[PDB]
Amino acid sequence: MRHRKSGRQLNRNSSHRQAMFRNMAGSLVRHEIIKTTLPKAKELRRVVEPLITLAKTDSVANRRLAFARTRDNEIVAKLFNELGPRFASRAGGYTRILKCGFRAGDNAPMAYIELVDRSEKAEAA
Amino acid sequence: NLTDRLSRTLRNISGRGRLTEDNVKDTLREVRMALLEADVALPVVREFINRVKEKAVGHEVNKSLTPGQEFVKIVRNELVAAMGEENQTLNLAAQPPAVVLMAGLQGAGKTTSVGKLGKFLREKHKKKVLVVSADVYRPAAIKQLETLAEQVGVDFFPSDVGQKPVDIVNAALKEAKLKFYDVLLVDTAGRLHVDEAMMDEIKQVHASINPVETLFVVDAMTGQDAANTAKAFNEALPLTGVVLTKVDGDARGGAALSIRHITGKPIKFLGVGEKTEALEPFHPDRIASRILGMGDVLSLIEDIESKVDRAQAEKLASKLKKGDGFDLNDFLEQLRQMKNMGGXXXXXXXXXXXXXXXXXXXXXXDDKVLVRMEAIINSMTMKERAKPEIIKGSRKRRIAAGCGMQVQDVNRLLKQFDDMQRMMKKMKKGGXXXXXXXXXXXXXXXXXXX
RNA sequence: CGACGACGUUGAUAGGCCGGGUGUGUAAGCGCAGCGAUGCGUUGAGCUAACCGGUACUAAUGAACCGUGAGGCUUAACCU
RNA sequence: GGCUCUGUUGGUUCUCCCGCAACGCUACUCUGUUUACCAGGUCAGGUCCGGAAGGAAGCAGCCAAGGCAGAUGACGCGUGUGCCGGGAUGUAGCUGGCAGGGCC
Ligand SMILES: Nc1nc2c(ncn2[C@@H]2O[C@H](COP(=O)(O)OP(=O)(O)O)[C@@H](O)[C@H]2O)c(=O)[nH]1
Numbered sequence A: 001m002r003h004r005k006s007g008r009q010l011n012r013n014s015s016h017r018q019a020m021f022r023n024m025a026g027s028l029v030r031h032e033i034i035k036t037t038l039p040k041a042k043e044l045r046r047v048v049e050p051l052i053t054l055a056k057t058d059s060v061a062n063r064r065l066a067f068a069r070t071r072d073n074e075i076v077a078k079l080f081n082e083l084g085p086r087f088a089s090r091a092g093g094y095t096r097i098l099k100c101g102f103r104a105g106d107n108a109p110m111a112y113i114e115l116v117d118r119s120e121k122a123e124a125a
Numbered sequence B: 001n002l003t004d005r006l007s008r009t010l011r012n013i014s015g016r017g018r019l020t021e022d023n024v025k026d027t028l029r030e031v032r033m034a035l036l037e038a039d040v041a042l043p044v045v046r047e048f049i050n051r052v053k054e055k056a057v058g059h060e061v062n063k064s065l066t067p068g069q070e071f072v073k074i075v076r077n078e079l080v081a082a083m084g085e086e087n088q089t090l091n092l093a094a095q096p097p098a099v100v101l102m103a104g105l106q107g108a109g110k111t112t113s114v115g116k117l118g119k120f121l122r123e124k125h126k127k128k129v130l131v132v133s134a135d136v137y138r139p140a141a142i143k144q145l146e147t148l149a150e151q152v153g154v155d156f157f158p159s160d161v162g163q164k165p166v167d168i169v170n171a172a173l174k175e176a177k178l179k180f181y182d183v184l185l186v187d188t189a190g191r192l193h194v195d196e197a198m199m200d201e202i203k204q205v206h207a208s209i210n211p212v213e214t215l216f217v218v219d220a221m222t223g224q225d226a227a228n229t230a231k232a233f234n235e236a237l238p239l240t241g242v243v244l245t246k247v248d249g250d251a252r253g254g255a256a257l258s259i260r261h262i263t264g265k266p267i268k269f270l271g272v273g274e275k276t277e278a279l280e281p282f283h284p285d286r287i288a289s290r291i292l293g294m295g296d297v298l299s300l301i302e303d304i305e306s307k308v309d310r311a312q313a314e315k316l317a318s319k320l321k322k323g324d325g326f327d328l329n330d331f332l333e334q335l336r337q338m339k340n341m342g343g344x345x346x347x348x349x350x351x352x353x354x355x356x357x358x359x360x361x362x363x364x365x366d367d368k369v370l371v372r373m374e375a376i377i378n379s380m381t382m383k384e385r386a387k388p389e390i391i392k393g394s395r396k397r398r399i400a401a402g403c404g405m406q407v408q409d410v411n412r413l414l415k416q417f418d419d420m421q422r423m424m425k426k427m428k429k430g431g432x433x434x435x436x437x438x439x440x441x442x443x444x445x446x447x448x449x450x
Numbered sequence C: 001c002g003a004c005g006a007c008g009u010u011g012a013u014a015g016g017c018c019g020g021g022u023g024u025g026u027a028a029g030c031g032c033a034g035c036g037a038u039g040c041g042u043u044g045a046g047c048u049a050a051c052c053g054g055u056a057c058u059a060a061u062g063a064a065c066c067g068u069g070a071g072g073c074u075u076a077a078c079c080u
Numbered sequence D: 001g002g003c004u005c006u007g008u009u010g011g012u013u014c015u016c017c018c019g020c021a022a023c024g025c026u027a028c029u030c031u032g033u034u035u036a037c038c039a040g041g042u043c044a045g046g047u048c049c050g051g052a053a054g055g056a057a058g059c060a061g062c063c064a065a066g067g068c069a070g071a072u073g074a075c076g077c078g079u080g081u082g083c084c085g086g087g088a089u090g091u092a093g094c095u096g097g098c099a100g101g102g103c104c
């Protein structure tokens, strides 16, 4: 009985999940857009975005904290020098999810997932 | 004057560097005064100037011709972006009846706007419209709205000065819901932000009818008071948009920028005239384009810019089409260079290990084959060349009939072109030394020719 | 699993975001004290899942598709 | 001290016609590009006939031309401008002057 229970198992044990979301988060932040399964990507929301909320306030504490979330310096320095300023005036909803066809091998539903400003800052550059 | 002042400023201060904050001083001052003469709210002017600074720090200006021109371009882009987007329209989707509330100062043209929107929604949107006058103050205002409604062919809800705005708009809303009206237009009395009773009145009305659309009607000639009016009206009511009137005048109309910045509400309408049939949609680029007068300076510049644009476009497209990969164009070039330079006798000598296995006389004559190939290629359109994968049987028929040969030969040359494309693709993917050393002579067994 | 329930922009259905509650128990940095471990001050600090209250920031699409066009015969009882 | 309506006259609005001057609207065409063979012209290359002389079917390119757009002159449909324009017409409506009564 699942009542009011949040989080999705995705057929992995605990630590495995945690890690997978760290690298998925890292990967997204780095490329600003990725293609993954639908449910993995609905769980990624709940990781990546709070990171962003973290970067919207700059201090040594938060740098460190997000490092402990993602374990990468490239990712954190990007987070605070780019995404922090970028989304500064927006409330939540930093990611957009777009469903597409099915992974040909296993027939899984796929979704691109991306930062909302992926487009306009890739055009203006 | 803008272009002249900016160009003069950027020329006299600095030579050709990459533009820096120190050079934008007099620029920002002249732009400031330009907006001050444009009747733009001073805080809006400053807050815009800040953005101009932010854009000035990273200037790519150095590579262009006229710095003032592209600076003008940046300012125009920022201003248009500040004006909002286009195709802004009231939400007539809404659950009928759609209630539109009017708000503004005295003599703002709210009533005429009600008439205009009445005719506009009636004729173009095929909507059933009911109009009502909440003004018990202004003499013959109700008669005016009734007259306009009679002219635009829109039903009018009777009202008098002996009644109260609340009961009036409530009875109007009730009548709109009972008769299944599509759109309910509510005209209200012009009021000042310093008036408490009138603000409480329009607040009680807005709370009563719960309009899906709340419009703010302000004159285009409005001065620095536009800031106070916009702020007060925005804080008093949740405006769904702003309606600018008397735009046809020679007025600068910076009040639009003022209200747009402060309220944050988009402008959905621009009154182009006094008459009811005259109305225009709000175009950010059009409004942000002109506060000025000039001549003969901008034409040549726009011409030169167009020339540079089309030149850079064509030159980049030419490299882009050739940069897609290997095609029948490069194949054609290599084939004509082949038939001109054809080395069959010499290439038989140049090759050593392939001649020891394959036959010595197996080399085909270059002239006939390559002339055939050239001529058959000459039967092909430019599209079938750059994009070889669209070639089908009927096109092969056209080609074969054009060159006066058999379709199988066309298929043969398409096969050879497929081989050449594959090979050159392998040359592009790997090294020429790894790929030249990866070339292998196929032998189906250690017996020769078997 | 089908199924039932809510919602699909005229929208609080989901996540986010803001506020609270809860839980843990005074973060990190800095300053002071001590030879040093550690302690004291900033400080009930910092973080906080599934909770509660708000907020259209992201996704809930304009459409299309299924479904039709007054509904058998007989008899009776009223009605022309 | 004001007003109304008759006699006469000056304007104005509406309906019809027209002049001068002063502001504003479609369909076609000129440029921008587009359309493989199956509308057309030139038709390279190649190919067909001939010893030769030369002709021929016709691909591509180009030009019409056919799609889609950026605006050029005349036709078609309108007008709170001025000459209080010139007229026709109302048994009309509105307004003013004058000769005035009468009502307060
Ligand atoms: N030129 C022009 N005049 C306008 C516009 N809107 C209103 N007016 C003028 O405003 C005058 C009356 O304004 P009104 O509607 O009565 O003011 P409100 O009822 O308080 O909003 C009219 O004589 C119009 O000529 C417009 O968009 N353009």
Ligand code: ALF
Residues within 6 Å of the ligand: B105, B106, B107, B108, B110, B111, B135, B138, B141, B188, B189, B190, B191
């Ligand atoms: F003149 Al108004 F409302 F008609 F102030």
Ligand SMILES: [Mg+2]
Residues within 6 Å of the ligand: B110, B111, B135, B138, B141, B187, B188, B189, B190
């Ligand atoms: Mg009014």
